[PDB]
Design an enzyme around this catalytic site. Structure first.
Site, PDB file in Angstrom:
ATOM      1  N   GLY A   1       0.786  -1.239   0.000  1.00  0.00           N
ATOM      2  CA  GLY A   1       0.000   0.000   0.000  1.00  0.00           C
ATOM      3  C   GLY A   1       0.824   1.299   0.000  1.00  0.00           C
TER       4      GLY A   1
ATOM      5  N   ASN B   1       5.391  -1.345   8.974  1.00  0.00           N
ATOM      6  CA  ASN B   1       4.703  -2.639   9.019  1.00  0.00           C
ATOM      7  C   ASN B   1       5.104  -3.341  10.319  1.00  0.00           C
ATOM      8  OD1 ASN B   1       3.945  -4.384   5.781  1.00  0.00           O
ATOM      9  ND2 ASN B   1       3.239  -2.393   6.527  1.00  0.00           N
TER      10      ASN B   1
ATOM     11  N   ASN C   1       4.789  -9.870   4.210  1.00  0.00           N
ATOM     12  CA  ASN C   1       3.403  -9.472   4.331  1.00  0.00           C
ATOM     13  C   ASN C   1       2.906  -9.072   2.939  1.00  0.00           C
ATOM     14  OD1 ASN C   1       0.948  -8.030   4.698  1.00  0.00           O
ATOM     15  ND2 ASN C   1       1.997  -6.250   5.622  1.00  0.00           N
TER      16      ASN C   1
ATOM     17  N   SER D   1     -11.069   0.673  15.833  1.00  0.00           N
ATOM     18  CA  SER D   1     -10.691   1.743  16.762  1.00  0.00           C
ATOM     19  C   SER D   1      -9.223   1.710  17.231  1.00  0.00           C
ATOM     20  CB  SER D   1     -11.624   1.743  17.963  1.00  0.00           C
ATOM     21  OG  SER D   1     -11.495   0.537  18.668  1.00  0.00           O
TER      22      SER D   1
ATOM     23  N   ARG E   1       2.075   6.933   7.860  1.00  0.00           N
ATOM     24  CA  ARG E   1       1.799   6.522   6.449  1.00  0.00           C
ATOM     25  C   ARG E   1       1.631   7.760   5.541  1.00  0.00           C
ATOM     26  NH1 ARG E   1       1.155   0.697   5.459  1.00  0.00           N
ATOM     27  NH2 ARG E   1       0.369   1.478   3.427  1.00  0.00           N
TER      28      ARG E   1
ATOM     29  N   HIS F   1      -6.143  -7.819   7.994  1.00  0.00           N
ATOM     30  CA  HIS F   1      -4.994  -8.226   7.189  1.00  0.00           C
ATOM     31  C   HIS F   1      -3.677  -8.233   7.989  1.00  0.00           C
ATOM     32  CE1 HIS F   1      -2.217  -8.856   4.029  1.00  0.00           C
ATOM     33  NE2 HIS F   1      -1.666  -7.666   4.133  1.00  0.00           N
TER      34      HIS F   1
END
Lengths: 283, 285, 283, 285
Positions: free
Chosen positions: B42, B50, B110, B179, B189, B264
């Site tokens: 992403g 990560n 991942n 949450s 990010r 995920h």
């Protein structure tokens, strides 16, 4: 450490249960883990969990391989209700008599059917819930049923022989040249020495079609912490059921061993011991 | 030395197969048996982002831990790829091992990094120890999930129109318990997206050249000899759960572990279980 | 053949059901097929089955697209029990009033939830059971839930807009450039013209969490002949459920269209018409 | 002419790709648009045996129906194959079309014949019309079923130790309702085993050279452009149901139909539904 040698019997008195004796193997000191064996010809606590008892003990555990009613060196019975219920009522009853507040339950197949029933009825008497390829749970979404091993199991109950017993155990392992004499002969003898049990089990399946065991609509109720294990290659209970379990038990984790038949605990003994002791120690 | 993102932060040039003095950003601590951790695909992904809930516990268990930034993510060099990223990312992992004198490394991967970890075990069987997979991509269609999955394609929406809100939506879809998200994760990010806008654009160009379907290595999974630990979040809305059976069935020596109530990111959302389970696997499997 | 134009209303009086009016579109003569629409903002009989009504009629059928209570041009309601039950009680009730012995039921999603409830309660009032991506049925074994389309559906119920409605329908089709104006605008208007319905549906989901719809433990009871259909690409109800259905309904067949979203009947209208008419004519 | 096994019985020599004056047994009736039916892989299988409950209704619906005996089964010539049978069987289907001046044929394939039908659509896209599959093999591992499945390997037990009892056991496993079995079906499979003992032995030799895993054409399913109808018995104990999703997901234009209370042989155990559904598909899809 052996059988005889951990050999212990005990009379129990719960629900509809006048003086009934249960044989069981026991060892060590600690938090209490009861191991519940599978539903097929000549299955006990010791034959089912003889590879696990030592490691679990070597790890600070009080371990009891239970002989569920109508099996090995316990007392014969005929049931009119699912052996999951009944069997569990028996558990709540070996506890009380050995005076035991709470236990950790490890239940293989019929064992797993029991272990789950116990969690349903006796929610405050159970520690952590370990399910290993547990029986009962309705139809698979992918396997035709009766599965191959169920068909072999009823074959063996109805016409017991040594040829048909090997046939059966080979279907029970992924790698069938792992079959040993200790395993073969142990079962061959709870068969010989407890013929009443073959006969009584079928009658019970007469009163209690194995479709009566289905706990599913009530799985939302389990508050215990559950570890579902399965062998990738289970020819006896279907794989997709670990998913059924996974999605319906509030607190569950699934683990699947590869190259492993129905009995993860015997065929993948090392990883199994490790995974469960560890789950028991820290989950 | 205290273990922080900067205290661990490093660079190395790699020169494998068409990479040439190409700069790899990574985060390293501990010493000994090496574990390299490979992040997902992403926008704004990086090794630290990560894996910052895993690195301390793996180091404390006696591992040397490397959180690598793949080519074209985070602080590594930029690149437009005309080949599948899993294979390209795996050459880069080899290049970094070579440059750093590392003979063999365990891989945790991942998603895009699981894809990358698979190619690495296929291409360089002698350079891998154990293989740990955490909802890897590169595995083709699902037998149940319509594709692109939800996550995928908030992922693609975010690559084309980076925005702070779409970033939050995307990350939430990664989680079972939405949450648990923190403003700092988000902001991390978001900085990574803003400070390297070229990576997003180079990603979309690269994917035009080599759609996700070209990343599918299902036909070769039978060549993997590494002992394999596959893990999935039950509730993964990004890559489909049935792919964890695909691996379980197609790799010789695999086992599979599904965490309940887990999006995920099992290594982040269930860090603690994940760390404990993967550490044990490394030690004793 | 059109809407208005098949437009018919009718007051109904079953169970807890004082004078309540149902609008519905009708046509032809024959054996009776009732079509039950899905559960989302501005869904009716006609919007859901407007591609099917003609063919099914051109085929010797008396077709009724039913507006289930609290939808389109019917009468608003708030429920305290699952809309599957309630909705069906409504069916048993449009039948009686139009004086109809038996019907064939086609039920999309909430429709399918209804159609199944009807078969459970009114076993002698139903012909053949056609289920199309039917709602309610518990958790998937593979899809995270709420599924994408459920999340879009509740989004739309809570804050209805045109932008969010298109968003929704695009998720509803495999190939979303198949979206037409007839479809878009029809729904946009049962939304505008029946705002009470958005509000009332949420309240009902307040009283009746969609997990209350789960008919599963009672599926063994269905005696009707069932055709389960699903689009391979259903982002709204999970695929694996056609298997749940398949394994639990005594007489069932499963068919799955590829490159098809939730609405097989609209997106794969031709094959759908053909498969179902044919199932109706000859199964 | 009345339609019976002998009244339809024919032979043709084929000369495709290494077949050379190799004799194909088939059963043919009707005229017009051609449907070739390809039988499964158990001992004593043949076109008539797999498809004698389907041939009359397909002919009556306006098709020319060909029940072909694959190489090394029933009355066709014997052969030890060193390549995968699906591909070899598909060259033979082409060879028979060529010899018979048939440009394009619809294929119905059961098991080994479904495998064969898949290869044929891959190799000769221009010679196929519609593709109908009925629990095809050639599709790799299952995501749920331990392999070899039960059926498989009564199949292999029967190939190595042909016996009348193992034959009955095998056939019963093919059925959901085991009592539907007839002594005449059994006796027909049994004659076919006894009168061509070489086929069983040549089958086992062939499988040593080219195990079932070499039949897996999953990686190429995306090349199939034929409009596809996949059918499975719910209760198939021979090939796994999840493979019907594998096809559904991997072929461009497919649909899937599962019959309840149905073993492996849907065309026999549910002939009537099967005939009606496949005839409609042919006519109107």
């Amino acid at each position: 450490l052996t059988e005889s040698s951990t050999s212990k019997f005990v009379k129990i008195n719960e629900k509809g249960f006048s003086d009934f004796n249960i044989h069981y193997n026991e060892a060590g000191n600690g938090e209490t883990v009861i191991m519940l064996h599978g539903g097929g010809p000549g299955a006990g606590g010791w034959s089912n969990y003889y590879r696990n008892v030592g490691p679990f003990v070597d790890a600070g555990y009080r371990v009891i391989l239970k002989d569920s009613p109508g099996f090995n060196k316990s007392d014969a019975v005929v049931m009119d209700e699912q052996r999951g219920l009944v069997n569990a009522r028996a558990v709540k009853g070996l506890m009380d008599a050995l005076d035991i507040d709470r236990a950790h339950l490890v239940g293989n197949s019929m064992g797993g059917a029991t272990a789950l029933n116990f969690a349903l009825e006796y929610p405050d008497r159970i520690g952590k819930l370990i399910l290993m390829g547990p029986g009962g749970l309705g139809p698979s979404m992918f396997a035709p049923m009766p599965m191959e091993g169920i068909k072999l199991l009823f074959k063996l109950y109805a016409e017991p022989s040594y040829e048909t017993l090997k046939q059966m155990l080979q279907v029970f392992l992924y790698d069938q040249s792992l079959i040993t004499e200790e395993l073969l002969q142990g079962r061959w003898e709870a068969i010989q020495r407890q013929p009443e049990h073959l006969k009584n089990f079928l009658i019970s399946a007469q009163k209690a079609p194995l479709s009566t065991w289905d706990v599913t609509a009530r799985l939302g109720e389990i508050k215990a912490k559950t570890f579902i294990t399965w062998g990738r290659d289970d020819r006896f209970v279907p794989l997709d059921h670990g998913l059924k379990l996974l999605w319906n038990i509030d607190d569950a984790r699934l683990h699947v061993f590869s190259k492993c038949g129905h009995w993860a605990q015997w065929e993948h003994a090392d990883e199994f011991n490790r995974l469960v002791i560890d789950f028991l120690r820290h989950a």
